[PDB]
Symmetry: C3
Subunit: 450 residues, 3 copies
């Protein structure tokens, strides 16, 4: 049967001390609530009812493309009241899973188990065992059935020893939610309608409440401040790193590795310490990434070595290429197979053909460079003062001497040779040699001021 989700995401997150609302703070570069939205979608949720409130304007702007139902909460009256704002949109015959926008690490797998355990017209409740359950709602079972959730201040000495606690995550059908939520009262010290009461109400109607235990407590932990968020970040990164290690990615130190997006990898990929992978990154076979590198939205072909302290974004690198150390590829850099980009080199929105080398102290922007070119040290592509940024076209088999200024728009045809210290403003023809004629003054017997 069908499934929909309700995600609670209205909290201010005061102890974040931020202008952002609580759930927009990120884990692995992705807002906490977006983790939960994605998980809900992976589960095959038909609708996703997002209960929002504080920072509502920023929620709308940051999540504008999410396929969610925008249910605004104007007052905090507990979890049952929040969920009831979404309940008119529940289908009687679909399951509803309740989730929390500030508890981002809940997994599809745990939720599949939970959903499978839900007995007809009953509830599946997610629980977890804690060594010190102090302050959490104790799960009371009679026989092997869950009958109630007893809060810390209500529990007796025998109940306080119960290690199994309530996580707040539960599954029931829509009809049962609409029915039971209407029977929830708020006659308590907080004056709030509590979702925990659905466990009692279910048993009241001779409906079964089954418990499923979470794999890791971190799946159900919420982040109330940046310290707690950092702990979730580290647990998540370790989990990501472990998965990649077991798939055969050699990550030299998984405690010094960060993935903030998605990584597709070949075999025998080696990643040294302090690498950051962002957005969508694809690495071919036998790719070696040196220490300190940052790759954001890149495709790296087989057998490429990226040496230390290289920063790449929105770029493509062909097989057997060599990048770094201290290389900068900015958006639109496309390096063909067997290319060489060296230290203190910046490539922006340019194509560099097979076998070409750009090895020192160079800026190439808005350029097309052909195959087997030699781009000498200190070469700079530049523009005239004025408007837009025009293109430099360099053909195949061109030698560009060190410190050459290539002033766009300009074309250098196949097989040209440009001497060092040249300023190229006019097009260079095929097999044309251009060398700068220098005027120098020579003074003999000049004694230095030393």
């Amino acid at each position: 049967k069908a499934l929909s989700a309700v995600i609670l995401a209205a909290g201010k997150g005061t102890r974040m001390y931020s202008d952002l609302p609580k759930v927009l703070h990120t884990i692995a570069g992705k807002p906490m609530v977006k983790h939960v939205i994605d998980t809900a979608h992976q589960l095959g949720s038909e609708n996703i009812h997002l209960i929002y409130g504080h920072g509502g304007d920023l929620m709308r702007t940051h999540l504008a493309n999410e396929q969610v139902n925008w249910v605004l909460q104007t007052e905090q009256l507990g979890t049952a009241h929040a969920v009831q704002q979404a309940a008119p949109f529940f289908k009687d015959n679909e399951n509803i899973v309740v989730l929390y926008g500030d508890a981002p690490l809940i997994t599809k797998e745990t939720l599949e188990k939970l959903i499978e355990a839900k007995p007809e017209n009953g509830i599946a409740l997610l629980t977890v065992n804690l060594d010190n359950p102090t302050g959490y709602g104790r799960i009371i079972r009679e026989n092997g059935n869950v009958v109630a959730i007893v809060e810390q201040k209500d529990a007796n000495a025998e109940q306080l020893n119960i290690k199994e606690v309530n996580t707040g995550v539960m599954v029931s059908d829509g009809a049962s939610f609409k029915k039971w939520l209407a029977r929830v009262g708020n006659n308590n010290a907080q004056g709030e309608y509590y979702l925990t009461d659905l466990i009692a109400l279910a048993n009241q109607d001779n409906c079964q409440v089954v418990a499923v235990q979470a794999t890791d407590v971190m799946e159900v932990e919420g982040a109330n401040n940046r310290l707690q968020l950092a702990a979730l970040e580290r647990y998540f990164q370790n989990k990501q790193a472990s998965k990649l290690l077991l798939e055969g990615v050699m990550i030299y130190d998984p405690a010094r590795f960060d993935l903030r997006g998605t990584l597709e990898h070949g075999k025998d990929v080696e990643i040294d310490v302090n690498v950051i992978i962002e957005g969508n990154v694809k690495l071919g076979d036998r790719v070696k990434i040196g220490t300190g590198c940052v790759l954001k939205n890149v495709v790296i072909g087989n057998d490429v070595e990226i040496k230390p302290y290289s920063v790449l974004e929105d770029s493509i690198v062909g097989e057997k290429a060599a990048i770094g150390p201290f290389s900068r590829l900015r958006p639109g850099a496309e390096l063909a197979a067997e290319t060489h980009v060296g230290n203190f080199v910046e490539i922006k929105k340019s194509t560099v053909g097979k076998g070409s080398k750009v090895n020192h102290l160079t800026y190439v922007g808005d350029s097309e460079i052909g195959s087997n070119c030699n781009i000498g040290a200190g070469v700079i592509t530049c523009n005239y003062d004025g408007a837009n940024k025009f293109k430099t076209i360099i053909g195949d088999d061109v030698f560009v001497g060190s410190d050459t200024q290539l002033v766009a728009p300009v074309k250098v045809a196949n097989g040209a040779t440009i001497g060092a210290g040249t300023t190229i403003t006019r097009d260079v023809g095929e097999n044309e040699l251009v060398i700068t004629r220098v005027a120098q003054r020579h003074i003999q017997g000049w004694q230095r001021p030393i």
Copy 2:
């Protein structure tokens, strides 16, 4: 009543295998003893009696500006003998707190509690509970009063089970210190006068000895070698990081963050992994610091992004500025609001006006650059061979073409335009265009040696 401190700092620290004396080794960039001196001052200590000895010459040079009384120890005869060298300078009616120069993490807060617990004419003793107290002096209480400190080799089976141990830190009044220290003997296996005997002597005179427990054992741990020092460093950095996280600084990985000095911050500040903050650093609201950055003595305005692998020192950065990646700001760099400093750029002792850009492969030193200038790639400010380093003055709205050499002293007035590859030795006037006339030799049909 008044307070003064005695800090023991005479040890050689042989297992450091260093030419430095023990207490000059640093935690968070600050000598261990300086941590303790500062804490003593935070407590409002009137005098700080520093017992020193080994590496005395280096102690004097490194701590020359500290407001301490320099009490030289010529021989090791135990803690009571060390403290007695300072005792002639104790005021009868002030409290005296005893501290250790190689135990740097003792907190003001713990010491306030200790000082408050000191009963009139009595002693307040700092204690700590250990799971394995083996080798530490056991605290013996009778009723709820501390009566003795029993050393490991003296303790009976029942006493060896006591988990509460002596840390060595204590508070008493000056009169009581002068009195009891004179009654301490050295008839023991080390032949040393022990400060622990003051607990007995106090009870002997019907004076009360009250115990206060330290928060963390790391407050009372001493560093005897670099391994132990590293452990103190890591605990201290984690504590610093946690505080900042709870104040709302987003530190992506607190295990990969270092603060060596002081940080003042706005809201929504983000600090990526492997950042080092040194000296006095001020960050405004919404500052983003990328991976690998080093900031030493800097002021960074609101909304500034510092991209990866940038190194900044003794610099000021205005709001909405953009720095990095691979940017170097050396002392005296002053960047106005909305400026742009890019990769492989070095700025030294220069002012850069609002909206100006210095984006590639450039050295600017001893310069004033105005507002809305375009400093092209490969631009270098330089001097003539000889003496001092003179100034380059660039006005507002100037375009400096790529690879221009600006030879100081020189001035370029408002609205000037300088073509690429130019050497500027003479002043440039307002709205003056200077372009380099090149001589080139063109040879057609030059077949490259390929």
Copy 3:
């Protein structure tokens, strides 16, 4: 008496998901089996019998210079069968130690203890205590003698409580190995000949089997996948870091330090976070290494400071030199005492004499630079288009102006002065001043397009 080793190294390591065989994956930059080969050699092994199989071709190429006996295994029939392939080469009167190529952290010291404990005509067995010994062969002692090793599936309730387990490492004499290995059978669920049976067989012949316990369980752990390998890497690096810390090297964070080879150090050496030391590195007294540096095969003299994000390889640095930040020394860089190499500078296969400075945005390759030279910003040594890479010779006391192109082969003699923006193609004589005569067009009242 003599000693030889047998190392089992035939496994495929399927869960590495690699084209490499299991034991060629590295710890600290060195293949796992090479760790074990070296340890065996440190113990004074006369022969080293390497049992190999999967990835045999790659084993031969990667380990071609190892002094090992190449014993090929064509089928897996257990540890006793593997060892028996080597047994014809055992000398009757030498000890034989059995080791595993995928258990790289076994120490010489532990193995010395093991070898000393071996009773005449008996076996010394390496054991370890585990809190949870589930799945490991339990060591059964009668009196205080080891009589058997009982496997998990065979053990009774009382035996399952035994915490002491078999590591697989053992020592016996060659005659005893040849004898007992021939009596090992394979009538078991795997159909394999097990080395564990030698413990029974020894007791059968009234020979004593003595047990020695490993220091750390990590000495006997094998790496079956990259996750487990990473754990061995981290344990090994921490152990290396701890040793250096206790020798008096100040390593600011040992969890962010990597040694992949050997380090020789002086006193008062300081190493900041995220440094990587590779190959053979020698650091003199008071060397300071800043954050992010990479040193591979370098010799660094006394009092040298290497500032952040510098990468050095196959280089020599004289005393009191200053390198970085953002410096690149490539193979064959030789810097004399009191030299200065600054940001965005690349030095390759060049000698730089005493007191000389190369401080910005510079490439020096295949060069000899004398003493007290000033190599200005933007200076580039380059070649003509064509064949080999020729040399630039710069004498003592030379000033090379910013942006100078030095076109090899060329010589600049003692005391020469070269103005900024010069292209040097012809030799420069002693005390010769060369300055570039520029042609510039000046246009007044040029209004910029702004």
